[PDB]
Symmetry: D2
């Protein structure tokens, strides 16, 4: 069992109203689906990622990341978002992330290919 | 078959001398191993990610991302890197990425949790 | 007069308890001092930046940025932070930013030179 | 005199063909003009920034940053870019940066307000 396997597994919501459904494996795997409340997206998209299954015991957070490519049976936004952040456990559990969203571009437009932002996920709302 | 499944699959090297070994699935999956030439790392780490298996035909790049959590049987750096970028095919194929590397921290130090940088991968060196 | 010259000018506080004192010029200049509640810093540091003195009238925010180099008469942290974001006016005015903090490194360590994060500034606290 | 005042002062060119003209002051100031070869820009824009005027003597780089707001007498792109990076001296002097480019948006679109990228400046081309 990963130390935070049970803490991470389940349904999470961010500040935009997006929904992240994840299963944490004992081996450090994250698998699930993402539904974005914003952007060129509809319905659910596959996600995959990794987490630290043996975090420090000094009250540090648990490092994790995941990827969504924005193609499903409904739409293709020719883009991928990666979230990098940490899981913080306790009464008000949260995942605090920063993300990079790259779109496919021509070489001429590649300077303008990547957005950056930050999402906070909680188990309520 | 994903349009760039055969182009992405294989062994890639970045400017630091790191090695990325990836298999691209027809469904948009990326699986493989990463070996970092720098940092608190040794030997290979599991990676997982996603790519756009049906990219635009206008000469745009192919959006992709992947995650490594820096725990293996040798070391645990209590961190995760996510790479977000695009695959550009042709004689001099490349994957151009930006990355976020988050370490687990206490809440007091969380402002200092995340590095950002950029890696370029090629099929030679 | 810049459209938001009077809105931006004054004293701002972020979520860490840092204090930003700024004067907005009619020409798009930002000048002032920054005091960080965290990190290798004490007392005030000079800041300089720029803002859009003629923003869109469609309810968009006002784009701005500024720099602090972390050298003053007390300490030198051999680093510089740049904040990039937007000013949003009204009852609960805010400046929403993302920042890059680069430290001077050797060429070998340059991959690890730059932190990224996000600060929200308000006129109260 | 700042240790790298003479090294930084002058004309720099990046990989896109943009031109950065800067004067470094003894007090840590950077002032000058920027001309972008790409994007919603024409002619020169005012820049302001800061650098570490007393860097480490261990072969570390010199931390610096600067801001451009993309308004001049010709155009207004309602955006600001901040560059954060380091100056590396010697036969092949360079400024290695990462940047954040924020556009003014409505609150609904603020998740999509900020691009990230990387520019390398040299004294030739």
């Amino acid at each position: 069992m990963g130390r935070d396997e049970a803490g991470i597994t389940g349904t999470w919501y961010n500040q935009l109203g997006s929904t992240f459904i994840v299963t944490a494996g004992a081996d450090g795997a994250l698998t699930g689906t993402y539904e974005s409340a914003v952007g060129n997206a509809e319905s659910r998209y596959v996600l995959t990622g990794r987490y630290d299954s043996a975090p420090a015991t000094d009250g540090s957070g648990t490092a994790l990341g995941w990827t969504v490519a924005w193609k499903n049976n409904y739409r293709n936004a020719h883009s991928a978002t990666t979230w990098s952040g940490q899981y913080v456990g306790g009464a008000q559990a949260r995942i605090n992330t920063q993300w990079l969203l790259t779109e496919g571009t021509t070489e001429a437009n590649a300077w303008a290919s990547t957005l950056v932002g930050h999402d906070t996920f909680t188990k309520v709302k």
